[PDB]
């Protein structure tokens, strides 16, 4: 399948070169997979989600996304126009309040929630969790991400936006999950992207168009935007049967575009997520 005039990041993930604008992908499109977006919520009524999104859990007075961040991330995972995996099922877990903040204890509870809740959902092709959040190093936060991964969920986490070594941030620094840095449309490391040996992969993160609350759209930047590209890619590849939740991060790194990004610090992987789809 070909989506013309796609957001640059979608085009990038199906291309061996920057500077194109069509996204190419197998029509299975993540059908039969599920992606949990652990964030500020998801505006599931957005036409872009086509009934495939739902809120399953909140720790606050509403499950609605009063911020937009979670809706944007969910759109990059799986919206019809802005999403990598256009037929996946999206499940929202609201661990962040409408200001975008959340206590680590709530975030940990949300991760353990997903590890159990997947047993209440139909995801024959596999389960992914996208975590566009983080703060300073916490062994308990890292351990929660490790448990979620161990339970059979492909965990993708943002590296962070500090232009610093991600070893000092959580859950970015957890070795067993997929830690995602951000790149721009010219294949440069995004100016804010964290780096370091703990990163597994880069995805598009600068000037990413996606869904927003109020049935709208907007372009924003962050490792929060790169992470759902990788989460959606994992769901897409699991639906194709090419990899599993336990092996998808390594498979994405195996099959990435290699050595094409600029301003990658010595010791950080130079790997850009790529679907290897041959139309």
Resolution in A: 1.0
- DSSP line for the chain: -EETT--HHHHHHT-SSSS---EE--TTTTTTEEEEEEES---TTSGGGTT-EEEEEESSS-SS-SSSHHHHHHHHHH-TTT-SSTT-EEEEEE-S-TTS---HHHHHHHHHHHHHHGGGS--TTEEEEEE---EE--HHHHHHHHHHHHTTEEEEEE--SSSSBGGGEETTT-TTSEEEEEE-TTSBBPTT--BSTT--EEEE-SSEEEEETTTEEEEE-SHHHHHHHHHHHHHHHHHTTS--TTTHHHHHHHTSEES--BSPPTTS--EE-------
**Per the annotation, does 204 bind a ligand?**
no
- Cβ partners under 8 Å of residue 244, min gap 6: 126, 238
- Cβ partners under 8 Å of residue 177, min gap 6: 145, 146, 148, 149, 155, 156, 157, 171, 249
**Per the annotation, does 76 bind a ligand?**
no
Measured CA to CA, the distance from residue 89 to residue 171 in angstroms comes to 24
Catalytic residue among 14, 15, 33, 39: 39
For the chain, what are the domain ranges? 2-272
**Per the annotation, does 228 bind a ligand?**
no
69 assigned to active site: yes
65 assigned to active site: no
Catalytic residue among 130, 187, 224, 229: 224
Phi, psi of 97 (to 5 degrees): -75, 180
**Per the annotation, does 200 bind a ligand?**
yes
The CATH code belonging to domain 2-272 is: 3.40.50.200
Measured CA to CA, the distance from residue 80 to residue 247 in angstroms comes to 26
Phi, psi of 134 (to 5 degrees): 165, 170
Tokens representing 120 are 């209440």
Q: Furthest-apart CA pair in the chain: how many Å?
A: 46
Catalytic residue among 14, 65, 69, 184: 69
Residue with tokens 């962040």: 96
What radius of gyration do the chain's Cα atoms show? 16
**Per the annotation, does 16 bind a ligand?**
yes
46 assigned to active site: no
């Amino acid at each position: 399948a070909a989506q013309t005039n796609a957001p640059w990041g979608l085009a990038r993930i199906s291309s061996t070169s920057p500077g194109t604008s069509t996204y190419y992908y197998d029509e299975s499109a993540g059908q039969g997979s599920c992606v949990y977006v652990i964030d500020t919520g998801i505006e599931a009524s957005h036409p872009e989600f086509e009934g495939r999104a739902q809120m399953v859990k909140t720790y606050y007075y509403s499950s609605r996304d009063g911020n937009g961040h979670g809706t944007h991330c969910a759109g990059t995972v799986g919206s019809r126009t802005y999403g990598v995996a256009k037929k996946t099922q999206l499940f929202g877990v609201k661990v962040l309040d409408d200001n975008g903040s959340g206590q680590y204890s709530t975030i940990i509870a949300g991760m353990d929630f997903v590890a159990s809740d997947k047993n209440n959902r139909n995801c024959p092709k596999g389960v992914v969790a996208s975590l566009s959040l983080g703060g300073g190093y916490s062994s308990s936060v890292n351990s929660a991400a490790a448990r979620l991964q161990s339970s059979g969920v492909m965990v993708a986490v943002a590296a962070g936006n500090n232009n610093a070594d991600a070893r000092n941030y959580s859950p970015a620094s957890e070795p067993s999950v997929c830690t995602v840095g951000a790149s721009d449309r010219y294949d440069r490391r995004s100016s804010f992207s964290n780096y370091g040996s703990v990163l597994d992969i880069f995805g598009p993160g600068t000037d990413i168009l996606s869904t927003w609350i109020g049935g709208s759209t907007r372009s924003i930047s962050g490792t929060s935007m790169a992470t759902p590209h990788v989460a959606g890619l994992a769901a897409y590849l699991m639906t194709l049967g090419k990899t599993t939740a336990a092996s998808a991060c390594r498979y994405i790194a195996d099959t990435a575009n290699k050595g094409d990004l600029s301003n990658i610090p010595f010791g950080t992987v130079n790997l850009l997520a790529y679907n290897n789809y041959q139309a």
